[PDB]
């Protein structure tokens, strides 16, 4: 059974960048629903599989990817943020960033653009290509998870579904992206990077 | 050149079902952006076509469908709503509804379910199948327009992108759908129906 | 464990409409690989589900839908054909066809159109819509199965992957469609239609 | 007006790797239809654009991407092959291949994998990423063109639609891939690589 992880900080810890109302709805309602629905779908999957019911397994895929993906993405998102966050990363990761994107600023532009470029609901990601052995930016639709659909290792994700910013920034998604950089938890991102550089 | 149509009523005319803040942002910001971006993309399309640049034409498709679709959908949505709205339709349309969906209530359930069922951004629609000569409910992702992608004639659309309801109903999309029935402009929907029954 | 079903007839039982070489390859090779690959994929899925590895379950979806769908579709296809096929259905089924498509001739043309219309690999289908309670035609891409991705109950399917006709008809898919009508097992399609008649 | 390009060689110039029957059908029939169908689609698009008919422009996208992509891909494919092909590239291109894929052998295996991996119709590609400034492998479905749907500049493409190999290799696509390496026109791929070398 999958569970909703506790937020690693207070709901208002990311203010004024992401307000408390958004954080609370985001965690207690949106993420909660993803794990609850995921557990329901996996149980139905368990039943379909035991029966060899291929039709049922296939009909269940949209719900499994959407809900399971929702859980995966938000669980990573919470850890990617921090009240003491902001600034730039250091060492090997910063090395890679400058190497793979020219500079930190060029990286910010590219990730921002990938995030602002999502038409509809989705996510912008900084990931790691284990095969090429380098960093890579990608965008995912709806709740499609980075690794399950692209094979890339998630390092930093930016949720651009409207529920992630609308109450505070309304239609101005670029202001939300500008503000989020101030709360990125580079320690966590670094951790994830070093974890796949092994 | 495409233009942003005036709303056929005051921004607060649909209260308390859809508040004025949402209507104003919805029309003046979201729809505006769709037509502005559409005009930009069509102009680029005009250039690509004159040159026989197939690659450019194809690269331009996502923006054309998204923005052009945004314009089509919202232009219909505004007319599908009315301050004096609500209740049930009459005559031939009501006939079709009962015939094709069992009853009005069964129709409401089905359209609502199609609308609540959209994972991510999208629209729920009551359309008309000219080939089969009957009504049909469908759901469209992001701004994909009903007719251009399904061939069905739009009669009644329900925008379920989060910007269409979040500020007022937050994560509770079912409350938004419950409320919207009170402002449906059945006169307009009837008009559209009789227009394709010719 | 899923198994490759024997054909209801000899490989050259459908000559000259679909030649022996095609039937043998299509069954002994194409279908064979789908069943074996499906079993392998399911096993991996059972393991991923057991560990609660969501990323793995998601990464396996393409293979499950592709191989499971290939198994579902082909199993249906073989029973939809018969050396003594051809002509038209009778009683109930014929009645429904006249009712929903105007006439048997029109229906053939409609299903032929959906089949010829597939860009790339796929399938053309005559299915039953339980909710609306009527026949419906649909086209599915690659091996996406009708019921699992659409909800319609499959009654008659036409495989338009090039491997289904290229050796004999080359690039002229319409010649293949014209020919297949001569071997359709209407007895089986009728059986399938009467089964979901609720 | 787009036109069907002549082949740079005789239909049986690539025997025994890709037989004459395949080359003739592939070029004189498949490519021929894409160019003619593309022109017809473009005309309809110019008309729809002129009227500002957005629904029509959108309904035409599938045909434009499919036929325009078919024209783009095949035009590239013919120049990527040569009776005197085979072996490996030299200088700059080879250098980049060793750099981004480890070795030429590894690169072949990577591109073979992408090509064999396509479920349904499609294409496997070696392209150039202008932003990252390196080679990249990608697979495209049906006739979706590489640059128009991905941004990568096409350098070498491998057609894995069944019509590209079924008459000769039947269901065994890997045998086709092994064979094609013997006719790759590295002179042309090198030319394409040096052209986007900015
Ligand atoms: Mn979210
Ligand atoms: Mn909207
Ligand atoms: Mn087949
Ligand atoms: Mn081809």
Binding-site positions of B for Mn(2+): 26, 74, 159, 163
Query: Which residues from D are below 8 Å from B54, CB to CB?
Result: 2, 38, 64, 68-69, 71-72, 145, 148
> In this structure, are residues B114 and C151 in contact, taking their beta carbons and an 8 Å threshold?
no
Instruction: Give a yes or no: residue A1 inside a domain.
Output: no
Instruction: Give a yes or no: residue B99 inside a domain.
Output: yes
> In this structure, are residues C177 and C116 in contact, taking their beta carbons and an 8 Å threshold?
yes
Shortest distance, CA D136 to any CA of chain C (angstroms): 21
B48, B109: one domain: no
- DSSP secondary structure of chain C: ---PPPPSS-TTTTTTTS-HHHHHIIIIIIIHHHHHHHHHHHHHHHHHHHHT-HHHHHHTHHHHHHHHHHHHHHHHHHHTB-TT--S---HHHHHHHHHHHSSHHHHHHHHHHHHHH-SSSEEEEEEEETTTTEEEEEEEETT--HHHHH-PEEEEEEE-SGGGTHHHHTT-HHHHHHHHGGGB-HHHHHHHHHHT--
Q: Give the total number of structural domains in chain A.
A: 2
CATH number reported for the structural domain that contains residue A36 in this entry = 1.10.287.990
Residue C31 annotated as binding? no
A73, A89: one domain: no
A68, A90: one domain: no
> In this structure, are residues B9 and B82 in contact, taking their beta carbons and an 8 Å threshold?
yes
CA distance B23 to B38: 21
User: Edge-to-edge, what's the strand order for the sheet holding A134-141?
Assistant: A134-141, A122-129, A153-159
- DSSP secondary structure of D98-165: HHHHSSHHHHHHHHHHHHHH-SSSEEEEEEEETTTTEEEEEEEETT--HHHHH-PEEEEEEE-SGGGT
Looking up tokens 């669980």, which residue turns up?
A75
How far, in Å, are A175, B93, B94, C136 from residue B101 at the CA level? 45, 12, 10, 16
CA distance D148 to D12: 31
B92, B175: one domain: yes
CA distance C165 to C117: 15
> In this structure, are residues C166 and D167 in contact, taking their beta carbons and an 8 Å threshold?
yes
Angle at D137 between CA D147 and CA B44, to 5 degrees: 10
Hey, what are C86's tokens?
């051809």
Hey, what are D38's tokens?
């593309």
Shortest distance, CA A91 to any CA of chain B (angstroms): 38
Q: Residue D132 class from Cβ within 10 Å (0-12 exposed, 13-18 middle, 19+ buried)?
A: middle
D189, D98: one domain: yes
| Cα four-point dihedral sign A42, A48, A54, A58 | negative
Query: Which residues from A are below 8 Å from B59, CB to CB?
Result: none
Cα of D84 vs centre of ligand 4, distance in Å, is 21
> In this structure, are residues B142 and A161 in contact, taking their beta carbons and an 8 Å threshold?
no
Cα of B98 vs centre of ligand 2, distance in Å, is 29
Query: Which residues from C are below 8 Å from D161, CB to CB?
Result: 120, 162
Residues 6+ apart with CB under 8 A from D16: none
**What method was applied to determine this entry?**
X-ray
Residues in chain A: 198
Instruction: Give a yes or no: residue C6 inside a domain.
Output: no
> In this structure, are residues A81 and A184 in contact, taking their beta carbons and an 8 Å threshold?
yes
- DSSP secondary structure of B93-137: HHHHHHHHHSSHHHHHHHHHHHHHT--SSEEEEEEEETTTTEEEE
- Other beta carbons within 10 Å of A135: 21
D137, D54: one domain: no
Q: What is the largest CA-CA distance in chain A?
A: 54
A145, A94: one domain: yes
A156, A114: one domain: yes
SS3 state at A120: coil
Looking up tokens 């149980």, which residue turns up?
A43
Q: Which of B186, D30, D121, B197 is nearest to C161 (CA)?
A: D121
Buried b (16+ CB within 10 A) or exposed e, A64-97: bbbbbbbbbbbbbbbbbbbeebeeebeeebbebb
Beta-carbon neighbours within 5 Å of ion ligand 3: C 159, 161, 164
CA distance B71 to B77: 10
CA distance A121 to B162: 9
Contact A143 B120 (CB under 8 A): yes
Which ligand number lies closest to the CA of residue A123?
Answer: 1
> In this structure, are residues D105 and D113 in contact, taking their beta carbons and an 8 Å threshold?
no
A95, A58: one domain: no
Cα of A133 vs centre of ligand 1, distance in Å, is 29
Q: Three-state SS string across C59-78, please?
A: HCHHHHHHHHHHHHHHHHHH
Looking up tokens 């052998």, which residue turns up?
D105
Looking up tokens 């729920």, which residue turns up?
B124
Shortest distance, CA D80 to any CA of chain B (angstroms): 19
Q: Is A107 left (phi over 0), alpha (psi -120 to 50) or beta?
A: alpha
Write the DSSP symbol of residue A185.
Answer: -
Which ligand number lies closest to the CA of residue B73?
Answer: 2
Q: Which of A109, A107, A111, A146 is nearest to A129 (CA)?
A: A146
Which ligand number lies closest to the CA of residue A73?
Answer: 1
Domain boundary residue, one of C82, C98, C117:
C82
What is the C-alpha end-to-end distance of chain B, expressed in Å?
30
D43, D70: one domain: yes
Q: Which of A67, A66, A181, A48 is nearest to A126 (CA)?
A: A181
Hey, what are C138's tokens?
């649909």
> Minimal Cα distance from D28: which residue of C?
C171
CA distance B198 to D187: 62
> In this structure, are residues B157 and B144 in contact, taking their beta carbons and an 8 Å threshold?
no
| Cα four-point dihedral sign D176, D178, D183, D188 | positive
Hey, what are D44's tokens?
């309809």
* Phi, psi values for residue A90, rounded to 5°: -135, 180
Contact A55 C2 (CB under 8 A): no
C28, C104: one domain: no
Q: Residue B99 class from Cβ within 10 Å (0-12 exposed, 13-18 middle, 19+ buried)?
A: exposed
CA distance C49 to C52: 5
Write the DSSP symbol of residue D5.
Answer: P
Angle at D91 between CA D16 and CA D192, to 5 degrees: 65
Contact A49 C46 (CB under 8 A): yes
| Resolution rounded to one decimal, in angstroms | 1.9
Instruction: Give a yes or no: residue D4 inside a domain.
Output: no
Cα of B26 vs centre of ligand 3, distance in Å, is 48
Domain boundary residue, one of C57, C82, C107:
C82
Buried b (16+ CB within 10 A) or exposed e, C1-14: ebebeebebebebb
Q: Which of C130, C120, C192, C133 is nearest to C157 (CA)?
A: C192
C64, C161: one domain: no
SS3 state at D184: strand
Q: Which of A156, A140, A157 is nearest to A193 (CA)?
A: A156
Instruction: Give a yes or no: residue B8 inside a domain.
Output: no
Hey, what are C102's tokens?
């105007």
For strands D134-141 and D122-129, give the pairing. antiparallel
SS3 state at A172: coil
Q: Which of A52, A50, A44 is nearest to A68 (CA)?
A: A44
CA distance C136 to C111: 10
Question: Which of C122, C143, C161 is nearest residue D162 as measured by Cβ atoms?
Answer: C161
How far, in Å, are B138, D127, D156, D184, D194 from residue D190 at the CA level? 49, 12, 9, 11, 6
CA distance D164 to D158: 9
> In this structure, are residues A137 and A117 in contact, taking their beta carbons and an 8 Å threshold?
no
CA distance C99 to C103: 7
- C-alpha of A45 from chain center: 25
Instruction: Give a yes or no: residue D128 inside a domain.
Output: yes
Which ligand number lies closest to the CA of residue B163?
Answer: 2
CA distance D189 to D125: 11
For strands A153-159 and A134-141, give the pairing. unpaired
What is the extent of the structural domain holding D35? 19-82
Hey, what are A195's tokens?
């974890």
Angle between helices A104-116 and A173-180 (to 10 degrees): 140
- For A90-98, which contacts have Cβ atoms below 8 Å and span 24 or more sequence positions? A90/A186, A90/A190, A91/A190, A92/A190, A92/A193, A92/A194, A92/A197, A93/A186, A93/A189, A93/A190, A93/A193, A93/A194, A96/A134, A96/A135, A96/A193, A97/A135
> Minimal Cα distance from B55: which residue of D?
D148
Q: Compute the count of residue pairs across chains B and D with CB atoms less than 8 Å apart.
A: 77
Looking up tokens 């338009």, which residue turns up?
C160
Question: Which of C33, C142, C170 is nearest residue D120 as measured by Cβ atoms?
Answer: C142
Query: Which residues from D are below 8 Å from C167, CB to CB?
Result: 166-167
Beta-carbon neighbours within 5 Å of ion ligand 1: A 159, 161, 164
Query: Which residues from B are below 8 Å from D61, CB to CB?
Result: 61, 64-65
Beta bridge pairs of residue B108 = none
Instruction: Give a yes or no: residue D13 inside a domain.
Output: no
Buried b (16+ CB within 10 A) or exposed e, C18-42: bbeebbebbbeebbeebbebbbebb
Instruction: Give a yes or no: residue B10 inside a domain.
Output: no
Cα of C36 vs centre of ligand 1, distance in Å, is 39
Alpha helices (H) in chain A, listed in sequence order: 20-25, 32-51, 54-79, 91-101, 104-116, 146-150, 166-169, 173-180, 186-196
Q: Residue B4 class from Cβ within 10 Å (0-12 exposed, 13-18 middle, 19+ buried)?
A: middle
SS3 state at A154: strand
CATH number reported for the structural domain that contains residue C123 in this entry = 3.55.40.20
> Minimal Cα distance from D21: which residue of C?
C170
Cα of C71 vs centre of ligand 3, distance in Å, is 9
> In this structure, are residues B77 and B157 in contact, taking their beta carbons and an 8 Å threshold?
yes
> In this structure, are residues B164 and B88 in contact, taking their beta carbons and an 8 Å threshold?
no
Domain boundary residue, one of B82, B106, B134:
B82
């Amino acid at each position: 059974k999958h569970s909703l992880p506790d937020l690693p900080y207070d709901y208002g810890a990311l203010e004024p960048h992401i307000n408390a109302q958004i954080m609370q709805l985001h965690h207690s309602k949106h993420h909660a629903a993803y794990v609850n629905n995921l557990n329901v779908t996996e149980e139905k999957y368990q039943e379909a599989l035991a029966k060899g019911d291929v039709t049922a397994q296939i009909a269940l895929q949209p719900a499994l990817k959407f809900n399971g993906g929702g859980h995966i993405n938000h669980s990573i998102f919470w850890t990617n943020l921090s009240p003491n966050g902001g600034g730039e990363p250091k060492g090997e990761l910063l090395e890679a960033i400058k190497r793979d994107f020219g500079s930190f600023d060029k990286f910010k532009e590219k990730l921002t653009a990938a995030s602002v470029g999502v038409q509809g609901s989705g996510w912008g990601w900084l990931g790691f290509n284990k095969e090429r052995g380098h960093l890579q930016i990608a965008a995912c639709p709806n709740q499609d998870p980075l690794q399950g659909t692209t094979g890339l290792i998630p390092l930093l994700g930016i949720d651009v579904w409207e529920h992630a910013y609308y109450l505070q920034y309304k239609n101005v998604r670029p202001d939300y992206l500008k503000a989020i950089w101030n709360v990125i938890n580079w320690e966590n991102v670094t951790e994830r990077y070093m974890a796949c550089k092994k």
